[PDB]
Amino acid sequence: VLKKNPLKNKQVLLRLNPYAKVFAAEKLGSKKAEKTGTKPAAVFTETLKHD
Amino acid sequence: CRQEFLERVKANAAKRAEAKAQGVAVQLKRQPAQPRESRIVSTEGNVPQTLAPVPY
Amino acid sequence: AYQKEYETAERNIIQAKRDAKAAGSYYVEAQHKLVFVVRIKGINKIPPKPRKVLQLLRLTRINSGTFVKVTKATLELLKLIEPYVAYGYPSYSTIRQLVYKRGFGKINKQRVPLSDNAIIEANLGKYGILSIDDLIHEIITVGPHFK
Amino acid sequence: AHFKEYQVIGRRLPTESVPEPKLFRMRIFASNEVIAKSRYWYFLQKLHKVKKASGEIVSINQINEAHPTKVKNFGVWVRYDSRSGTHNMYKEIRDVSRVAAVETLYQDMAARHRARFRSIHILKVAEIEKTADVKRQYVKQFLTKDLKFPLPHRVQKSTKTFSYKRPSTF
RNA sequence: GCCCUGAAAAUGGAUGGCGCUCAAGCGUGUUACCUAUACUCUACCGUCAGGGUUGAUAUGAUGCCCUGACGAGUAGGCAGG
RNA sequence: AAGCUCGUAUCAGUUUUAUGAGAAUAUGUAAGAAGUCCGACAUUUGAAUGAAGAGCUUUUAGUGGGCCAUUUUUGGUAAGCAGAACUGGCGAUGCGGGAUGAACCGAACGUAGAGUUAAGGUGCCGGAAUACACGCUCAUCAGACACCACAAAAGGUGUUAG
RNA sequence: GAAAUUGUUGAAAGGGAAGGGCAUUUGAUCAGACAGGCCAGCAUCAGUUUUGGUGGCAGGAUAAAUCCAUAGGAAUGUAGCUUGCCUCGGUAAGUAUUAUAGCCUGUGGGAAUACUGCCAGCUGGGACUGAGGACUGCGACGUAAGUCAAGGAUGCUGGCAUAAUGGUUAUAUGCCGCCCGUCU
């Protein structure tokens, strides 16, 4: 009869897309990406700054 | 361009018979010009140079 | 798996840019093979040459929207109808919002709310796509069955 | 708008028997990336006979200026096409960064010559580290030492409509 | 670029009026704000189309039910009243 | 409208590939079984996109007064002017704005509620800020909107940036 | 024994217009039901939508910056020194490169923040709506019977039960409205 918008009515969200439930625990926007020491080149820096 | 059509159809039939002669995908349908994918470039041939729109 | 695929597809290209900077290279990015389109100008004082175009791209009314596969042809169309529409290169979250909220599908006529993956399997179980996330993947990575 | 600085580097085409046309960069002023790219093609077409189909971007880099705190008396060369035909200019500014300086400059040209952003080519923007190379006066008069000046007659602004005081400046 | 002049008729006369001059003007920008039968959502009506529906018990088969989209409109045409 | 045939059907005021006529725009055709060989080759069967359908026969009502705008083109001072051709708006067509309108901007209508916007605007009439920010200008008729009363050439010991 | 039209009474209004439309007030007037009708409020949830504060994340020069250490430089020249007067410091020069102030550039170091974008992250305020009408299904909670924000709203409470809401109607008020039909 009626259309309930998931992104709320999380029952309806989980009627779809049940990966949300395990999405919850890890919370999967705060993916703390492992940082790396990959540094740039002097040619990159000088082409950037200098005319 | 009817020349292009008639060479195209026999070319399609030829590669079809070839793909059936040695089993591989047939890939007979045309495609338009596609979007270009990632491809690395480095400024070793030439370091870049400003263009500096001076002319007047 | 699709989530892992998306985050991997973002991480590897981040690392591509970073390592190109480290090597003194410049990572060009793969051109976007997808767009979104919206109509701006309404039904009227429209010339016929874009009128048919919009009827082909299903942009009957104002603020009815859709996707397009990018090609040279479709780019000619977008360049043609530039004064009348708005388009760009969308994201997973935007598409998620759309297909969850205004996702409405066509079962043999008669536009329907999706509201279940059983609709998706009964219609598109032909093609293996049997859920809304498989559908979103088929769009955002332009599959074979994008049309 | 609230302008920004942008590096843009472009490459004519990957082609066979001319791989890697050499390179082409510009320093570009805009609010976002797209207007930078469009101005880049606009000026790059002018320099030589290439197009967007015969063109491609290498990459871009946003440019945060190095010294926000530092006052820097800039001086800038500009060409623009007015109502009448084109002509050139040199101007002199005392502002903080290139972005705020040119953001003031475009407003200034918009006032004094009805300069809309389309018809105005930034030829160059620069810094003047020493004195004795400034020519103008409307910058020079801010530079003497122990400099002080008043702000008389501050026009206060009340939110209320009525007030009971018959006010005073200072 | 702005400004003055070039650049005038006669019932009393108009940036639309009031009036406005670090503007309530001219040039540019940033946000915020206002509201149309256009857009979205929703109930109802009406048509149209796709589907299901004589079967016992019961009352209508042009009927009942489910879903969707659409609605301007002279001359003229069609159907129900 | 009534039949007959199709049904996924031939198609498109449309692009792209290819190639013509006459540089772009525009314009023409091809993009397959109705084709390939002497019984053999089915939806990767031959680009994209979209499809409240497509075609054949018979018949019926109304209609065949033009204006305006863009473009190519001829004349001139040009008109509420004429010579030609493509397209669009009108006429049948409401509504918000343009202070009001035969031609402008926007937008095409069931009845209603809530929401958000368009074009135009926010001193008051008038719903909405005497918001913020950079400059300019002081007119003894300042100016206040594009095409919906415009003039240049020039003159000016008024002001500003060059 | 209608209507135009006319008078008397009753009610109402009225400054160069009237009549009509949307909503409402005032006044007059009025039908229906209580033996379960009318008007409202509170809580929870559902749909659309608006507006706040707070939390976690990824990016770019792995922000630039600031900050810390570091070499050099110069001044809109700091201390100090020197000179002319001179109210005995106060000017003017000349020195002076941190000294009795400090700044700039260049290098190096480790963070944060803004800016952009992401959250199937939380949480609150406010409005409009309540459609449909034994059950059926995709669902969540769980060991479970069963429970539920799960294919359209219920529960609790109050007052009135009357011209109070509402309807009709004259009038005022805000705003709108170019006179009808026909040939052109």
β-bridge partners, D28 = D6
Under a CB-based contact definition with an 8 Å cutoff, are residues C5 and C49 in contact? no
Q: Classify burial at D77, counting beta carbons within 10 Å of its beta carbon; exposed 0-12, middle 13-18, buried 19 or more.
A: middle
- Two structure tokens written together for D159: 């939110």
Neighbouring-strand partners of residue B40: C27
| CA angle (B16, B19, B25) in 5-degree steps | 100
Does residue C7 belong to the interface with chain A, where contact is any CB pair within 8 Å? Answer: yes
Domain ranges of chain C: 1-147
DSSP D39: H
- Where in the sequence of chain D do the CATH 3.10.20.10 domains occur? 2-68, 69-145
Q: For domain D69-145, give the fold.
A: Ubiquitin-like (UB roll) (3.10.20)
What tokens were used for C1? 């798996």
Those residues with Cβ within 8 angstroms of residue D128's Cβ, 6 or more apart along the chain or in another chain: D72, D73, D74, D75, D92, D134
Under 8 Å between Cβ of C81 and C48? no
Whether A24 and A13 have beta carbons less than 8 Å apart is answered as: no
What residues of chain B lie within 8 A of the CB of A47, using their CB?
Answer: 43, 47-48
**Interacting residues of D47 by C-beta distance below 8 A, sequence separation 6+:** B51, B53, D24
**CB within 8 Å: B43 and A47:** yes
B41 is written with which tokens? Answer: 């470039």
Q: How many helices (H) and strands (E) does chain B have?
A: 1, 1
> C20, B40: Cβ pair inside 8 Å?
yes
Kindly provide the b/e burial profile for residues A3-36, where b requires at least 16 CB atoms within 10 angstroms of the residue's own CB.
eeebeeeeebbeebbeeeeeeeeeeeeeeeeeee
Percent helix, strand, coil in chain B, to 5, is 35, 5, 55
> Solving technique for this entry?
cryo-EM
- Please check whether residue D127 is in contact with residue D95, taking contact to mean a CB–CB distance below 8 angstroms: no
The closest nt to D153, taking CA to C1', is E22
Distance from CA of C111 to the nearest CA of B (A): 31
Multiple choice CATH, D2-68, 3.40.50.880, 3.10.20.10, 1.10.10.10, 3.60.9.10: 3.10.20.10
Contact B38 C25 (CB under 8 A): no
- Which of B45, B53, B56 is opposite residue D20, by nearest beta carbon? B45
The pair phi, psi for residue D29, each rounded to 5°, is: -120, 125
* Closest-CA residue of chain A to D23: A47
